Write a structure and sequence with these properties.
GO cellular component, one term (chains A, B): cytoplasm
Organism (chains A, B): Vibrio cholerae serotype O1 (strain ATCC 39315 / El Tor Inaba N16961)
Main location (chains A, B): cytoplasm
Number of helices of chain A: 11
Subunit structure (chains A, B): Homodimer.
Function (chains A, B): Multifunctional regulator of fatty acid metabolism.
Oligomer: homodimer
Strand content of chain A: under 5%
Shape of chain A: globular
Radius of gyration of chain A: 22 Å
Strand order of the largest sheet of chain A: 1-2
Largest interface: A-B, 36 and 36 residues
Number of domains of chain A: 2
Chain lengths: 272, 272
DNA sequence: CTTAGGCAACTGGTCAAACCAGAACATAAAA
DNA sequence: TTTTATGTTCTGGTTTGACCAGTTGCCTAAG
């Protein structure tokens, strides 16, 4: 393990399980330095990071106070909570799915009127790039499929000669998730209101973690593409009356798919 | 000024104006230590903070790369953005008001269904605590008016002495804004969906920044209170039928109030 | 020639021991 | 009694310079 990383995981977990409870005071830096096993400097960088995340309140002369997170932290903790409160990973995702289903008719609305075929262009881009499905397993010769530092996978949970067919399935899940997130976020910025885009930016780690498993099911990918083409039809037609109906039918359908995939969660699902 | 602070504002401002442009590479840590005037360690703490905010991408061996913010950062940058290009601080606020007017019918509906009782009680708490108006201006001998650390103003102003009654005006603005934020955020958490609460937690600095001036107007404060009571009437009544009417009449009304008050902006407005 | 070693010259990360500065509280002297 | 100093010692902030560790690429030595 690495010093700073272990320090951060130690402090965060100690706050979660109740060793550094919210509302108390984090012990002096000099003491955590010998309590954890890291030098003071490194521990201070960790502390600055965590405080910037909203776990702590720091100001010199006064003792470091352990914040009441969920009241100080932002949309980012939802990912961390998944690996801290795995028992309730069930609920978190369905919040993520609910929120997106609730606010999507809001920003897509405006997006379809203000920047109509910036919307249509990125949507078409997504749909046609989502032909990783009607192709043989290495489609990474199209696209100008160079900028994919986001989809990278070192699978080495292995024993046999199937690390090259499992890996490509996970790669497919990851790519479809890549384009899904691209769709929702880029459409969320073209609403003329930044906040809807910043929301997706905040939830991105959770979004990708959920998508990389949800899109390991072809049954979901085909509904996703159908959803995309329906949205495209809406934006092109220009009548937005049908938009909410589209979004909540997709919501309930993908909802049932998730209810099926909820039972058998990978056990690399809730981790860092 | 203090080292870490000047290093951070220097870096963020340099990224903003184009000296460390998005897409470029941040100079080596050893080079900025001598370009800025801070020791390397401190500069590293600053870098860790900024990277956690999403301004940079760090990994050792490779050069620190300056992220394309607005694609990496979250809801927090809107506040900094207010103080980086004040010229369009005009637009930013109108986003903060728009989003809130859009998503308020979303969570307030669910909050009025799941936790009707906690909703109305925290609302009642807010409304009755908002009797700082019908009282002589230093009213924090009520409430158990002790937990008041957000609630601080030694701005020092002055030429001499009517400078205990504008303080009290700004303090009235600050406390009313405090309760406004309490209402929206706490109602956003009692919806059963954490994300709506995390959104407000993320925007808290911008919300406080705008509110501390918007609520220096008594006419804005009582429209706010009548709004609170209308919402209370909705939650108590149990039919959510034009909760949305209530919310957007308040939206447009507060809209016009904001539209006259934008003209004369205090100009400690866009600063940290 | 080409190619597979391995050597530097980058980069960020960790480490050490002092010291600087704000905040607090006990306590002494003044009110 | 209460209250204004006042200073020791709590806390976090900054300094220094040295070393440790991945990354990349140049440049040998082997194919």
């Amino acid at each position: 393990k690495s010093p700073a990383g272990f320090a951060e995981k130690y402090i965060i977990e100690s706050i979660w399980n109740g060793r550094f409870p919210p509302g108390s005071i984090l012990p002096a830096e000099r003491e955590l330095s010998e309590l954890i096993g890291v030098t003071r400097t490194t521990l201070r960088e960790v502390l600055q990071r965590l405080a910037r995340d909203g776990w702590l309140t720091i100001q010199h002369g006064k003792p470091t106070k352990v914040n009441q997170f969920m009241e100080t932290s932002g949309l980012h903790i939802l990912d961390t909570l998944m690996t801290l409160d795995a028992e309730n990973a069930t609920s978190i995702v369905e919040d993520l799915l609910a929120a997106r289903t609730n606010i999507s008719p809001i920003f897509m609305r405006y997006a379809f009127k203000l920047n109509k075929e910036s919307a249509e262009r990125i949507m078409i881009n997504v749909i046609e790039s989502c032909e990783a499905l009607v192709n043989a397993p290495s489609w990474d010769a199209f696209i100008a499929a160079s900028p994919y530092a986001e989809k990278i996978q070192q699978h080495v949970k292995e024993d046999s000669e199937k690390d090259e067919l499992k890996r490509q399935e996970i790669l497919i899940a990851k790519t479809f998730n890549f384009y899904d997130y691209m769709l929702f976020q880029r459409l969320a910025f073209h609403s003329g209101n930044q906040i809807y885009g910043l929301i997706f930016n905040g939830l991105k780690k959770l979004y990708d973690r959920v998508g990389s498993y949800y899109f390991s099911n072809p049954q979901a990918r085909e509904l996703a593409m159908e959803f995309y083409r329906q949205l495209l039809a809406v934006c092109q037609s220009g009548e937005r009356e049908h938009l909410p109906q589209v979004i909540r039918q997709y919501g309930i359908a993908s909802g049932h798919i998730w209810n099926q995939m909820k039972m058998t969660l990978p056990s690399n699902f809730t981790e860092d």
